């Protein structure tokens, strides 16, 4: 349903962005309210579609910097800025988007995924796990495992 | 507080400002009294709050959303990429293109206020009850918007 719509929107958009090496950062509010970092962004309150997500992230456009925040089956804002993890040490492949995805999963139960601006690699942060450089299939399975209940 | 109308004109002006210098084609139609629900069905659903940033991101060329009409209704972007009827009036001439014909076309069959940014010249335009005022300047196009949504 709404999570299944969400997942297909995510997979199709990363499918476009990953080979093109377009940077992307999408955080999905789960139990804990992300409202604090939501307020830092451009309100959209838009329906989730692959097309809108792709348009948001097109390089050097007004909306593509910062995080898209998904709240209750809607793109709540774009251009939100997340807490940075106190680690860095991210040489090649990994960048500030990954650092922000990590720093937010340290203070909430958000599901955040990243497409690397440098390599097009797909990453997910959730719980205390950073799963980096997934395949489109591995990405999609993680999404379903985390977002759909049971099956 | 700022009015949903007022914010929406501010959004329109800022995006045209950005888009017109760069010859970025835009085609935005605002529903008024006559329902545009037939053309709304042909587009990609957004149901998004109106901002200059979203509109600029919608019309960036070679993106999934940019071709066709953004359709405003109840101060939201109902859809993008919608298809409006092209005018059959032969006097439409060149210089103006599909976007302009779609805008003219929709004003023939509805009270909608539509405006256009030419993809080749950057020229701002506006249609409303058949009438078609083109090559406006930012101040022109702005004052026009205000009267219609007074």
């Amino acid at each position: 349903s709404a999570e299944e719509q969400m997942i297909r929107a995510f997979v199709k958009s990363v499918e476009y962005m990953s080979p093109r090496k377009i940077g992307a950062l999408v955080a999905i509010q789960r139990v804990r309210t992300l409202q604090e970092y939501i307020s830092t962004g451009i309100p959209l309150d838009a329906k989730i579609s692959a097309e809108l997500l792709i348009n948001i992230f097109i390089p050097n456009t007004p909306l593509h910097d910062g995080a898209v925040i998904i709240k209750e089956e809607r793109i709540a804002v774009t251009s939100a800025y997340l807490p940075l993890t106190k680690n860095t040490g991210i040489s090649k492949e990994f960048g500030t988007r990954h650092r922000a995805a990590i720093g937010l999963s340290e203070v909430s139960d958000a599901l955040t995924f990243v497409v690397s601006e440098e390599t097009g690699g797909i990453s997910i942060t959730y719980n205390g796990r950073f799963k980096h450089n997934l395949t489109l299939d591995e990405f999609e399975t993680e999404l379903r495992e985390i977002l759909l209940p049971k099956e | 507080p700022i009015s949903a109308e007022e914010q929406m004109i501010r959004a329109f002006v800022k995006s045209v400002e950005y888009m017109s210098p760069r010859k970025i084609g835009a085609l935005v139609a605002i529903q008024r009294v006559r329902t545009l629900q037939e053309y709304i069905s042909t587009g990609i659903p957004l149901d998004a709050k109106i901002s200059a940033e979203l509109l600029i991101n919608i019309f960036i060329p070679n993106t999934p959303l940019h071709d066709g009409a953004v359709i405003i209704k109840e101060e939201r972007i109902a859809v993008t990429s919608a298809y409006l009827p092209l005018t059959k009036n032969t006097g439409i001439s060149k210089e103006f293109g599909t976007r302009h014909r779609a805008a003219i076309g929709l004003s023939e069959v509805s009270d909608a206020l539509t405006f256009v940014v030419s993809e080749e010249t950057g020229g701002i335009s506006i249609t409303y009850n058949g009438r078609f005022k083109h090559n406006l300047t930012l101040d022109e196009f702005e004052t026009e918007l205000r009267e219609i949504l007074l």
Partner: peptide, 8 residues
């Protein structure tokens, strides 16, 4: 389902 458009 697949996306279409030639922006592709």
């Amino acid at each position: 389902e697949r996306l279409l458009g030639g922006w592709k």
